[PDB]
Every structure is written in structure tokens, then in C-alpha cells.
Amino acid sequence: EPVSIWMHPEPTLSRDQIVRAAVKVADTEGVEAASMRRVAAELGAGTMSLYYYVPTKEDLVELMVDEVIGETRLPDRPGPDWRAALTLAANEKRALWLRHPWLATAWRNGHPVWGPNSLRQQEFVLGTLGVFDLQVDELLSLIGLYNGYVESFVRNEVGWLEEARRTKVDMREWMRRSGPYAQQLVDSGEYPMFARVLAETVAPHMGPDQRFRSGLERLLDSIGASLDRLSP
């Protein structure tokens, strides 16, 4: 039976060096550029000798994820103020993804990453609502609202940065250039919800940081409303 990288003890070179060097490549070149042969060259080592520490590309990615999650700066305990605690975790996750853009898209597996940094972060996040009388699956559903918002926002933010390096058209410029088509769509009268969105939305005109915070505040109100009903 193939053994989890987390159950697979590691014996000049080390697993951590290999992982950190891989991360440094992916940060600027993407995860596909962080091949073993590339990471080997970065460490002045022979490629075959890397496999002794990290048996596969798949395992390298999983190690890379857990390694970076270790960079977040969370207190030991979430404390009683769940809003502040989730805001703190939200801001840290956003900053982490923007430092490591590949996090938004590198993971195409189903299985979760059960390395020590991810488990430690999960304690903090799951613990934020431990002071309400929730069943586990109620808890996990509310935390899914939180993760859903943060990851969707930042995945899109990192999509725009990626897209703009290809096209040199960023979000603001994209909205400017799409205006004549948007008007054509509104004037057709076929998309009245869309027309309402365009006429009335505020979010796209704020900077990214206040747009993130303003969505977070609404997200947290949505969790608070559910808490009112579940644990009254």
C-alpha cells in the first residue's frame, strides 16, 4: 500500500531544503516550473538524490502547501471574539495566497492535507466557534461559508494578476474596455438582473483591500445570523 508522505519518515540536503527551494520557484514561476529536476539544479544536486527525500511531484506539492501554511501568524488560541479571530485568519490567508499565488489552483486532488501546519491552522479556525453549542456538521457548514468567501475572492484576485501578465489588461481596464459591450447587453433588455448589478454595485469601484473587508463583514454577518438560529 502506498504510504502517506506524512507517515513517511525522512532520513547536506534535506526534505525541508527541497520544499523551500520548490516553493521559491513556484512563487514566481508557478507549480509546474517547480519540477524535481529544476529544484535539484537550484540546490546544486543530482535529481535522483532528491527522490530519497520526496518520492513524487504529488508529494512535493502537498509538502509545499503545508510548508507555506506554516508562515501564517496566528495566536495560539482564537479567543472569545470569533469575528476578530476569523478576520485575523482571513487577512492572513489572503496575504499568504498573494505571496504564494499557486495555492489558489495547485491542488487538484480530493484528499485534504494533514501536515502539521495545516492541522494547527485548522484548530484555530474550527475553534473560533467552539464557544457555541454546535454540532460538528453545523460548525463545518459555517466554516465552509468562511473558506468559500476567502478562497473565491482571492482565487479571483490572483486570476486577474495572472490574466493581466498575459494581456496587460487588469480589472479596472477590463471594466473600462467592456463598457460598450455591457451597454449593448443592458440595452437589449434581456438581462435585467445584470443591468441592476452594473447600475448599482459598489464593490468593483472600491480598491481590493476594502472590497475584501466589505465582503468579509457581510460574510461574518451571515455566520452570525445562522448562529442566532442554531445556538439561541
Ligand X SMILES: CC(=O)O[C@@H]1[C@@H](C)O[C@@H](c2ccc3c(c2O)[C@H](O)[C@]24O[C@@]2(C3=O)[C@@]2(O)C(=O)C=C(C)C[C@@]2(O)C[C@@H]4O)C[C@H]1OC(=O)/C=C/C=C/C=C/C=C/C(=O)O
Instruction: List interacting residues with Ca ion (CB under 5 A).
Output: 221
CA–CA distance, 139 with 151 (Å, rounded to integer) = 18
Of the CA atoms within 13 Å of residue 33, those in its CB half-sphere come to: 11
Residue 139 lies near ligand X (rule: CB under 6 A): no
CB of 205 to ligand X, least distance (A): 6
CB of 131 to Cl ion, least distance (A): 32
Cβ proximity to Ca ion: between 20 and 213 the closer is 213
CA–CA distance, 134 with 28 (Å, rounded to integer) = 42
Cβ proximity to its own copies: between 51 and 160 the closer is 160
Residue 49 lies near Cl ion (rule: CB under 5 A): no
Cβ proximity to Ca ion: between 178 and 214 the closer is 214
Q: Which does 102 bind (CB under 5 to 8 A by kind): Cl ion, its own copies, ligand X, none?
A: Cl ion
Q: Are 99 and 23 in contact (CB under 8 A)?
A: no
Q: Which of residues 97-126 bind ligand X (CB under 6 A)?
A: 112, 121-122, 125-126
Distances (CA, A) of 11 to 3, 34, 51, 52, 231: 16, 22, 12, 8, 49
Query: Residues 160-199: x/- map of binding to ligand X (CB under 6 A)?
Result: -----------x---x--xx--xx--x----------xx-
CB of 55 to Cl ion, least distance (A): 8
Q: Are 39 and 21 in contact (CB under 8 A)?
A: yes
* Dihedral sign, Cα of residue 13, residue 16, residue 22, residue 24: negative
Question: Is residue 27 a known part of a binding site?
Answer: no
